[PDB]
Structure 1
C-alpha cells in the first residue's frame, strides 16, 4: 500500500487525461485499496471537478500529486501532442484549482473539506 486516504494523486482513467484526485475510502467496501480480479492493486479515488465522480484505479495509473506543473512530466512518460478540447480543459482547470487548494491543507483538513457524501 503506497497511498492512504486524503493523499493527492493524479489518475489516468479511460479516455481521459491525467486528472487531479484525492484517495478516499470506497463508500460500500469501506477500504481505499484492494487487489482486483486480475490480482493487481487498485486505489479508490475521487476526481476533483465540478462533476463529482469516483473510481477504482490500477496502481500503475495513479501518481503522487506534487503540483499542477507535474502534468508535463506525466505526458513525457517531430514532437506529437494531443489537442486539448476547450470544454474538458475548463473542467480540468477547475479540478486543478481544487487540488492546488487541497495541497496547501493538511491530510485531516483535505479529508474534512473534500470527502464526498454518498446518498442511497
Structure 2
C-alpha cells in the first residue's frame, strides 16, 4: 500500500489526460486499495471536477500529486503535442483549482472538505 485515504494523486484513466484526484475509501468495499482479478494493486480515487466521479485505478496509472506544474513531467514519461477539447480543458482547470486548494490543507482537512457523500 503506497497511498492512503486523502492523498492527492494524478490518475490516468481511459481516453482522458492525467487528472487531479484524491484517494478515498470505496463506499461499498470500505477499502481505498485492493488487488484486482489480474493480481495488480488498484486504488480508489475521486476525480476533482465540476462533475464528481470515482474509479478503481491500476497502481501504474496513479502518481503522487505534487502540484499542477508536474503535469508536463507526466507527459514526458520537431516535438509532438496533443490538442485537448475546450470543454475537457475547462473541467480539468476546475479540477486543478480544487486540487491546488486541497494541497494547502492537511490530509485530515481535505478528507473532511472533499470526501463524497454517497446516496442509495
TM-score normalised according to structure 2 size:
0.99
Q: Shift in Å at residue 114 of structure 1?
A: 0.1
Q: Shift in Å at residue 85 of structure 1?
A: 1.1
Q: Distance in 1 between matches of 2:85 and 2:52?
A: 20
Q: Shift in Å at residue 102 of structure 1?
A: 0.1
Q: Secondary structure at the match of 1:9?
A: strand
Q: Shift in Å at residue 78 of structure 1?
A: 1.6
Q: Shift in Å at residue 25 of structure 1?
A: 0.1
Unaligned runs of 5+ in 1: none
Aligned residues, how many? Answer: 120
Q: Distance in 1 between matches of 2:66 and 2:93?
A: 16
Unaligned runs of 5+ in 2: none
TM-score normalised according to structure 1 size:
0.99
Q: Shift in Å at residue 17 of structure 1?
A: 0.2
Q: Distance in 2 between matches of 1:81 and 1:57?
A: 25
